[PDB]
């Protein structure tokens, strides 16, 4: 057995607009991950900037923020064995052109400029990202 983990997932505005929330949810659920918190939201500039602070110096920072506030997102906490890595494996590489066939990014995105999904990349970032978007009373382990 591996540790039971929680990770923060975002279906970005591109995939929400494509109306493929359900298909992406089924990738998680069929992989053995459970949706334990969820909310559709529309991020403010400030919140997007805070959430992606780690990339504040990167050349893509401005574009990322404008993209993430361009329309509603679907945010969820995924729980299961090895959830953090499992989610990342389902998402695929940052660049959809380089992502493996069958990943969410390969299947639902075309360029790095709009790449469908976010997932926490480590235990530490998972904790911070979950607490950013959900109070613990609105996360329901099962
Ligand atoms: N060169 C780029 N141009 C536009 N957006 C980018 C670029 N690189 C990264 N991004 C955006 O910033 C997000 C976070 O970057 P990063 O954490 O490095 O990738 P990942 O989301 O695969 O963990 C990416 O998922 C993507 O939406």
Swiss-Prot record:
GO terms for molecular function: ATP binding; metal ion binding; nucleoside diphosphate kinase activity. InterPro entries: NDK-like_dom, NDK-like_dom_sf, Nucleoside_diP_kinase, Nucleoside_diP_kinase_AS. ATP binds at residues 12, 60, 88, 94, 105, 115. Keywords: ATP-binding, Cytoplasm, Kinase, Magnesium, Metal-binding, Nucleotide metabolism, Nucleotide-binding, Phosphoprotein, Transferase. It is an enzyme of class 2 (transferase). Its cofactor is Mg(2+). Belongs to the NDK family. Homotetramer. This is Nucleoside diphosphate kinase. It comes from Burkholderia thailandensis (strain ATCC 700388 / DSM 13276 / CCUG 48851 / CIP 106301 / E264).
